[PDB]
Amino acid sequence: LVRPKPLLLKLLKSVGAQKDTYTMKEVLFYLGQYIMTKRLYDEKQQHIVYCSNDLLGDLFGVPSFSVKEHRKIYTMIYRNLVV
């Protein structure tokens, strides 16, 4: 298991999760569903995600990102985990 830090924990629970420990697969799953459900992705280039003025921007520390930058996204995710 991994333990999300406070802001990521809040984001995960906002999707409906209630627990404090997750597998990595669960963290990725709920984070992806958070973006999907909240319609944060660009309609035309759907790997672009808008983070400004959102919890997700608060915890990643960027205004936007591209899902194609795999190492960059995992780096932001792990900064918000205790593993």
């Binding site: 697969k25 990725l28 992806g32 973006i35 999907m36 992705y41 759907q46 790997h47 995600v49 899902v67 194609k68 795999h70 996204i73 995992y74």
Partner: peptide, 18 residues
Amino acid sequence: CNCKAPETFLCYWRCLQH
């Protein structure tokens, strides 16, 4: 989901995790 040409956000997101 074709990781050579994702068209959708969740397919990009799946491809991130391979």
